[PDB]
Amino acid sequence: TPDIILQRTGIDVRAVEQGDDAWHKLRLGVITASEVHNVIAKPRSGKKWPDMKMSYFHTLLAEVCTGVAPEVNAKALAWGKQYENDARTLFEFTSGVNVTESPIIYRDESMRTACSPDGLCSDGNGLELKCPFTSRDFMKFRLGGFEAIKSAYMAQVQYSMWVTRKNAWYFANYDPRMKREGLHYVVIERDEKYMASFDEIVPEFIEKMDEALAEIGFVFGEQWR
Amino acid sequence: SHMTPDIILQRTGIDVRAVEQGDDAWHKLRLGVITASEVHNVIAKPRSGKKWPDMKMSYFHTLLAEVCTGVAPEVNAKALAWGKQYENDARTLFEFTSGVNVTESPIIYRDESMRTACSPDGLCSDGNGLELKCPFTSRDFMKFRLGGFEAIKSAYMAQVQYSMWVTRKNAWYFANYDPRMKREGLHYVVIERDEKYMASFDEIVPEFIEKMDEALAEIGFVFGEQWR
Amino acid sequence: SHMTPDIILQRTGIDVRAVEQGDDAWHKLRLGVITASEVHNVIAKPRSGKKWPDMKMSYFHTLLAEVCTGVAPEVNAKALAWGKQYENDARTLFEFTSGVNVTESPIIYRDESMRTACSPDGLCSDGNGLELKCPFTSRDFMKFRLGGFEAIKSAYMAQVQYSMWVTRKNAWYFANYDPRMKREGLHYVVIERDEKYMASFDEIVPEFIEKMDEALAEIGFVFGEQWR
């Protein structure tokens, strides 16, 4: 749905690459899969937004009013740029599917929610594929599998399926350092409980955002000129 | 007794009037002293008991060590640098917005003892002091902007109250500045003096000083060696 | 059975006598091994329940990764460089003061299994082991200087006992040096072997080892592949 994006931000999605400066521009103020865990965080009791929730909320609003986002995990990111291709190939070789690239996908025209898949699979699944920074974390995944994977990571996988209207996702790891056994993955199925969470909470988050922008005099989208 | 430039100059060789925030002198003048930025640690209390809390012990060791080494390490240089860089920008936008005039004030000691002090971001024409933060992250600016007072963390309140205790003023402005903000990059509030804090300082601080004196003697140092 | 240079040489290709702390081999020899500095993690317990604590599972993963990759990431680099810079001056000063003469002892295994080791700061004329740190912050230095024994972090204690467990000794020196102190930049104590602790390693360690073993087999590895 390029025309929309284009009309909206003057950017041509096709030309984009994970890391592209545009890539980044397109994510500004947007609720993404990597960060949604924060949005759904709940107080043990009470209705009060947890801290990690207020904090994400505050981060998002600033992206809107400043038009920038600070950089994080430089070396981690770099590690990943470094090995993604090898990881991809192998994964394929091994999983038996062909993977193809996916720009960035928004849920709808509002452009308030999105995900950036690591790939789109021949069998119809999306792909999340990490090159953990510490071999310690690969071990953790490799041995514990599913129940090893973190909540923050489960929310991520689920939110991608919510945005793309998909039913299953691969969650894989790669570590070029392992003498053998360097690639591990699993398949995750869409879970309606998560679905229902998003449907309920995400829209509520968006409305508060707008209220706040209004209080201080901005409007969602200014970040895109 | 009342602190004078004359006293600082003779004890440390430094000319207060030439000092500028972040200067080398500015740093030296703070070695070993209980500052508003850190007092929060001094007044910390255990849930029950009388035992000094970890944060408290910890700042105690820190202060002592400044006395016996005469130096202090740097932390989060980046944020430090950030705050140091945007300060002037912040001051002048505050003057415009509040309408008051601001004067600069290095460091101010509570008395001739040189044990307690603060470094205001300015002194206002209406008699109030000024504290200007340039949060390193915009997220923080947004937090305050939207949350105001109640947004401001305890440490900040103690810092603001101690500045008033040291200088004997009745109110203080607290502001935030973010140069990255397209517009509206300055927000601020006014904090009034609070006796409950005054009192606490009055009781606790003096005691903290004595403990320090005891520990230094024990390893044969005397307060002040840092300005040698 | 006891460890000997021949084993090492035969199993890994390395000349143990030739090893220097921080040597490439020095590092090689530590891969997959449970050391004195990390043991605190293995001994860690949950307030209740028999479930491993987060730090335990973590170290546990870290070590397995060491076995399957044959490498280890670089860590706490600033702290290591600092200690590296002062270890000499610290030793010399300790010697003078304690009277003892100190000798280098690369690394030592508890046994031929090569699963357990330590790398003492030195070996003392009086047959005591030596742990000599250059704390990164002067604050920690002060902490110990003033509070001695009861001030030493659990982890440091574990590291100490682990070392006696490994070498089979009765006492060890725990000392600190701070080149920053204008005076009194050296302080130390003498720690006695504690049986409650020995029992502990004696019990836990072995189970930890069994578990690594299960886990590795589950993914087709066997301990020692790191030295291939």
UniProtKB/Swiss-Prot annotation, chains B, C:
Cited function: Facilitates phage DNA recombination through the double-strand break repair (DSBR) and single-strand annealing pathways. Also important for the late, rolling-circle mode of lambda DNA replication.
Protein name: Exonuclease
The protein's enzyme class: hydrolase
Annotated positions binding Mg(2+): 121, 131
InterPro entries, sorted: NF-kappa-B_Signaling_Reg (IPR051703), PDDEXK-like_dom_sf (IPR011604), Restrct_endonuc-II-like (IPR011335), YqaJ_viral_recombinase (IPR019080)
Required co-factors: Mg(2+)
Swiss-Prot/TrEMBL keywords: Exonuclease, Hydrolase, Magnesium, Metal-binding, Nuclease
Pfam families: YqaJ
Alphabetized PANTHER family for the sequence: EXONUCLEASE, PHAGE-TYPE/RECB, C-TERMINAL DOMAIN-CONTAINING PROTEIN, EXONUCLEASE, PHAGE-TYPE_RECB, C-TERMINAL DOMAIN-CONTAINING PROTEIN-RELATED
Subunit structure: Trimer of three subunits that form a toroid, with a tapered channel passing through the middle.
Known EC number: 3.1.11.3
A molecular function (GO) term: double-stranded DNA 5'-3' DNA exonuclease activity
Reactions catalysed: Exonucleolytic cleavage in the 5'- to 3'-direction to yield nucleoside 5'-phosphates
